[PDB]
Amino acid sequence: EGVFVSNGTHWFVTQRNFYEPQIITTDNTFVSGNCDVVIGIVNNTVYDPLQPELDS
Amino acid sequence: LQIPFPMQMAYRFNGIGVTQNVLYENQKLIANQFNSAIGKIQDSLSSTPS
Ligand SMILES: *[C@@H]1O[C@H](CO)[C@@H](O)[C@H](O)[C@H]1NC(C)=O
Ligand SMILES: *[C@@H]1O[C@H](CO)[C@@H](O)[C@H](O)[C@H]1NC(C)=O
Numbered sequence A: 001e002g003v004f005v006s007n008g009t010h011w012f013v014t015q016r017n018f019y020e021p022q023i024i025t026t027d028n029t030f031v032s033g034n035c036d037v038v039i040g041i042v043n044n045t046v047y048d049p050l051q052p053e054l055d056s
Numbered sequence B: 001l002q003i004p005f006p007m008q009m010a011y012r013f014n015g016i017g018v019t020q021n022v023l024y025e026n027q028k029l030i031a032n033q034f035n036s037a038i039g040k041i042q043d044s045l046s047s048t049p050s
Helices: B005-014 B020-025 B027-047
Strands: A003-006 A011-014
Antiparallel strands (some): A003 A011
16 A cells, blocks of 8 residues: 655655655555566565564 | 556546556556447447437
């Protein structure tokens, strides 16, 4: 629920009616297929709030 | 507010329940169907006199 934006260097996700940038995490996006047919695909690292928590 | 047309179509699909992956994975098919429908509209209005 939102749209991928970019301020030139980093990529953020915000709603479609108000600029509220936030880190693209796993709970903000859903996985559907591989990136070989989507026209306009760009490489970007997604965050997962499970790897830093599993450090202990 | 400027916006790419594929993203506009993704929003339209979200407005009826369909997700964005259905459009982004079948964009060429939807574009071809839209072009064919727009082309058929002309001959449908031309041939039919009523
Ligand atoms: C884009 O935003 C990030 C985080 O707010 C910041 O670190 C970066 O410098 C910004 N880039 C530009 C070109 O302003
Ligand atoms: C970066 O994107 C290109 C397509 O623009 C893709 O071919 C490449 O595999 C991507 N890089 C990685 C590490 O996946």
